[PDB]
């Protein structure tokens, strides 16, 4: 029942510790702390494959400015971030590996938090 509105302060307080847990993963979170810059990274085809880019800093901004109205929107952006990376990077690459590790941390952290919000 996702059209029920939550208060931005309450969403921030419950969901931000799960975002901080991702940021704490070093070096696994390093590829995800800023938007993908295809020029910087030498991958000019990135925006051809990844139509809706997402990363930790954008999620964090949306959380800090109250842009999520309900918590699955946050969960959606997190998985969008991980899906983009699993889609774009080769299964044998370091980034793919970091993505799988970071997604594992997120699954652990998010479940009791979402349980306590529903
Ligand atoms: C071509 C491989 O790069 C990527 C390809 C795809 C994606 C995604 C998320 O789909 C990410 C990266 C990526 C990005 C960054 N950091 C920055 O882009 C950045 C840092 C500061 C400013 O920009 C570091 C690394 C990285 C690390 C760590 N150790 O080895 C490598 C390599 C990898």
| Domain of residue 95, CATH code | 1.20.920.10
Counting the structural domains of the chain, the total is 1
The CA 62 to ligand 1 mean position distance, Å, reads 22
The CA 37 to ligand 1 mean position distance, Å, reads 9
**Which residue is associated with the tokens 């652990």?**
108
Would you state the torsion angle of the CA atoms of residues 53, 54, 58, 60, taken in this order, to the nearest 10 degrees?
Answer: 180
Dihedral sign (CA 25, 27, 32, 33): positive
Residue nearest to atom 33 of ligand 1 (CA): 31
**Which residue is associated with the tokens 């690459």?**
93
The CA 114 to ligand 1 mean position distance, Å, reads 30
Contact 75, 9 (CB under 8 A): no
Elucidation method: X-ray
Q: In terms of residue numbers, what domain contains 84? A: 1-118
């Amino acid at each position: 029942m996702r059209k029920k509105i939550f208060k931005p302060e309450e969403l921030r307080q419950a969901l931000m510790p799960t975002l901080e847990a991702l940021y704490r993963q070093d070096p696994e979170s390093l590829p995800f702390r800023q938007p993908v810059d295809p020029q910087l990274l030498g991958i000019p085809d990135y925006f051809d494959i990844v139509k809706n880019p997402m990363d930790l800093s954008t999620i964090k901004r949306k959380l800090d400015t109250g842009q999520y109205q309900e918590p699955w929107q946050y969960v959606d952006d997190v998985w969008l971030m991980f899906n983009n990376a699993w889609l774009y990077n080769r299964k044998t690459s370091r980034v793919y590996k970091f993505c799988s590790k970071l997604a594992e941390v997120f699954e652990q952290e998010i479940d009791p938090v979402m349980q306590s919000l529903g």
